[PDB]
Amino acid sequence: ATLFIADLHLQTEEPAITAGFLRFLQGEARQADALYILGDLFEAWIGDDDPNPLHQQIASAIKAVVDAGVPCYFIHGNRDFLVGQRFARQSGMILLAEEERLDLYGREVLIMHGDTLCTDDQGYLAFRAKVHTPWIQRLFLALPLFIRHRIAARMRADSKAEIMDVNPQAVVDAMERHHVQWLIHGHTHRPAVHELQANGQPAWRVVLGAWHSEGSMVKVTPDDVELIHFPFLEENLYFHHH
Ligand SMILES: CC(=O)N1CCc2cc(S(=O)(=O)N3CCN(c4cccc(C(F)(F)F)n4)CC3)ccc21
Ligand SMILES: [Mn+2]
Ligand SMILES: [Mn+2]
C-alpha cells in the first residue's frame, strides 16, 4: 500500500496531533511502500534555519521511517511552502513539484496539495502569487529569524481577523492536462470521494481530511482506494446493565 496524508498543521500548541503523527509514523507508515505528505504538515514555516525543536523531532521521526526502507515524499501546502532542502535532508524526505503524476499499482494518479484548485478565492490566489514569487521568498528568508517570527505571527493574526472549496472546472483542467482518471489532494478539509468525467471517461477526486480530532489518510492498494480515519492515541479499551 501507498499512504497519503495532509493538513496535519503540526504546532507546539497542539501536542496531541504531534503524538498522533508520531504513533502513525511508528506503526502504519513503517509497513507502507511509500508515504506522501501533500502539504500543510506544519501550521507555519519561516525557513529551515528555524530552531523550533518540533521541527527536529518531526524530522527525526520521518527519518526513522525513511531508514526503515519507506521512501517519504513532500508536496508543499499553503502554510509550509518555505520547507526547503535542508529540512528535506534532515528528514530524508524528497521534495516534489506542486503537481505530480504517479503510477500506483498500474493506475495513473495526479497528486497535489489542492489550494491551486480553489480558483474562486481570488483573494487567496493573490496572496499565493506574492509569497510564491522566488525573489520575494529569497528576501524573506534573508531576514533575521526574530524578524521572520514577528512577521509570521502578525500575518497569522491578520488572517484570523472558512476554507474555499475547489472549482469544478479547475479540477477537470488538471485531470485532463495530466490525462489521469484519479486525483488525490488535501487543503479543503472535506474528506470525500467524488466522481466526475475527465478525458471522456469516469474519474475520481479523493480528498484528505485535516488532523483536527482524529487522523486521516488515503491508502492506495493494487485492489482499491481507502479513505481511513483513526484516533490520534492508543485508545485503551476498558469496561452497562440489561
Ligand atoms: C491563506 C494562507 O495560507 N496564509 C494566511 C496567513 C499565513 C501565514 C503563514 S506563515 O506564518 O507560516 N508564514 C508567513 C510569512 N511568510 C512569507 C513568505 C514569503 C514572503 C512573506 C512576506 F512577508 F513578504 F509576505 N511572508 C512565510 C509563511 C502561512 C500561510 C498563511
Ligand atoms: Mn490545511
Ligand atoms: Mn491548505
Binding annotation for Mn(2+): 7, 9, 40, 78, 113, 187, 189
The residue whose grid cell reads 521511517 is 65
| Integer angstrom CA distances of residue 221 from 2, 38, 107, 120, 183 | 7, 18, 10, 33, 15
Does the residue 112 lie in any domain? yes
Q: How far is the CA of 160 from the centre of ligand 1 (A)?
A: 13
| Residues present in the chain in total | 242
Q: Give the 3-state DSSP-derived string for 9-52, with helices as H, strands as E and coil as C.
A: CECCCCHHHHHHHHHHHHCCHHHCCEEEECCCCECCCCCCCCCC
> How far is ligand 3, taken at its centre, from the CA of residue 201, in Å?
28
Q: Give kind and range of the element (H or E) at residue 173.
A: helix 168-177
Rounded Cα distance between 184 and 179, Å, is 14
- Provide the annotated binding site for substrate: 78-79, 121, 159, 187
CATH code of the domain covering residue 142: 3.60.21.10
Q: Which domain holds residue 210?
A: 2-230
Domain assignment of residue 173, yes or no = yes
Atom 11 of ligand 1: nearest residue by CA position: 152
Residues 6+ apart with CB under 8 A from 235: none
The answer to the question of residue 242 being in a domain is: no
In a domain, 216, yes or no: yes
Classify 142 as helix, strand or coil. Answer: helix
Method: X-ray
Domains in the chain, number? 1
Q: Does some domain include residue 215?
A: yes
